[PDB]
Amino acid sequence: KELVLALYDYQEKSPDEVTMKKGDILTLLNSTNKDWWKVEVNDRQGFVPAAYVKKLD
Prior knowledge:
The PDB classes it as signaling protein. The entry lists the keywords SH3-like barrel, Actin capping, Actin-binding, Cytoskeleton, Phosphoprotein, SH3 domain, signaling protein. The protein contains no helices and five strands. A hairpin with a 5-residue loop joins strand 2 (25-30) and strand 3. It has a five-stranded antiparallel beta sheet, with no helix packed on it. It has strands at residues 3-6, 25-30, 36-41, 44-49, 53-55. It has a single domain (1-57), classed as Roll (SH3 type barrels), CATH 2.30.30. 0% of the residues lie in helices and 44% in strands.
């Protein structure tokens, strides 16, 4: 597993993005991009800004 913690709220602005709330724990799916990470937030997958999450492992 790789988990990350949402440091801020983020609301999706494009079709490939997802929404998260501060304090959510998200499953990290792909961190190859330096600016945008693909995560799973409960049941949805998509991108959020990498700077807005913190790796936990």
